[PDB]
């Protein structure tokens, strides 16, 4: 879930890349507040302080040209010790590694999963789901997380 996800990505990319940091994930939730959650990483490291910097920057540079501001707040984050992940290249870094997935397809042989990444296709994640193996499209998934082994 996001507004104008590419526009948002580029408006966020400008302070992220000005700081030399890297984007990972963008996600929004709608509820008691409605709020935007940014996953950033930099392999030298992301401290709380690096989040503080990029967050004060986006809190200015997005707000002043917001396409929407309903109930709004945001956070910026390191992607966790169990990490959310979003693209073929992400799963490809992590072939052989345990994962959980939830999908836009919602059907028996349940499209809610625990998996170990088997291989990556250009359109799909192939994965050792339930100790079986199966494959799910990058478009037919909707959210995924990696090394859920770490609590």
């Amino acid at each position: 879930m996001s507004t104008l996800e590419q526009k948002l990505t580029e408006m966020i990319t400008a302070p992220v890349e000005a700081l030399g940091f890297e984007l990972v994930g963008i996600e929004f939730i709608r509820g008691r507040t409605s709020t935007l959650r940014i996953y950033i990483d930099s392999e030298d490291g992301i401290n709380v302080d690096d989040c503080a910097d990029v967050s004060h920057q986006v809190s200015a540079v997005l707000d002043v040209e917001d396409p929407i501001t309903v109930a709004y707040n945001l956070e910026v984050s390191s992607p966790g010790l169990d990490r959310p992940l979003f693209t073929a290249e992400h799963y490809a870094r992590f072939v052989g590694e345990e994962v959980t997935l939830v999908l836009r397809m919602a059907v028996q042989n349940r499209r809610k999963w625990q998996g170990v990444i088997k291989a990556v296709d250009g359109e799909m994640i192939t994965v050792t789901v339930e100790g079986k193996d199966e494959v799910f499209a990058l478009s037919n998934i909707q959210k995924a997380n990696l090394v859920p082994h770490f609590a």
């Binding site: 992301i46 302080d49 809190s59 109930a71 707040n73 956070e75 910026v76 984050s77 966790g80 609590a151």
Partner: protein
């Protein structure tokens, strides 16, 4: 009502939980920062809040507030936490301790410094 009712059923004085239960009445607890992040509170609210998801030795994982200035603090790092409520934030009932086991003192600060984990200036 009647004494006869009170002997038939005595006064049920209520129980109450620890409002900070993931301590199990330990005065502090240790954990690891499963993720760390910084939030604006609201649309006009500029005061960034610094917050961590942290898993304790007892296998609970909970939110805790990061008071004061920045740190090394990053996901493989480890933290001591204690009771304390951020009144404006939802459910944030645990403060991280300044000058704890993986945690720096606020080097600059000259006031209240025994809160902020920082030693007397070396003059």
């Amino acid at each position: 009502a009647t004494v006869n009712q009170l002997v038939r059923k005595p006064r049920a004085r209520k129980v109450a939980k620890s409002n900070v239960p993931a301590l199990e009445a330990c005065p502090q607890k240790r954990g690891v920062c499963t993720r760390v992040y910084t939030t604006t509170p609201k649309k006009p609210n500029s005061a960034l809040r610094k917050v961590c998801r942290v898993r304790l030795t007892n296998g609970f994982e909970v939110t805790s507030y990061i008071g004061g200035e920045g740190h090394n603090l990053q996901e493989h790092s480890v933290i001591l936490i204690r009771g304390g409520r951020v009144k404006d934030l939802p459910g944030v009932r645990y403060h991280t301790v300044r000058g704890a086991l993986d945690c720096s003192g606020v080097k600059d600060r000259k006031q209240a410094r025994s809160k902020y984990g920082v030693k007397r200036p070396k003059a």
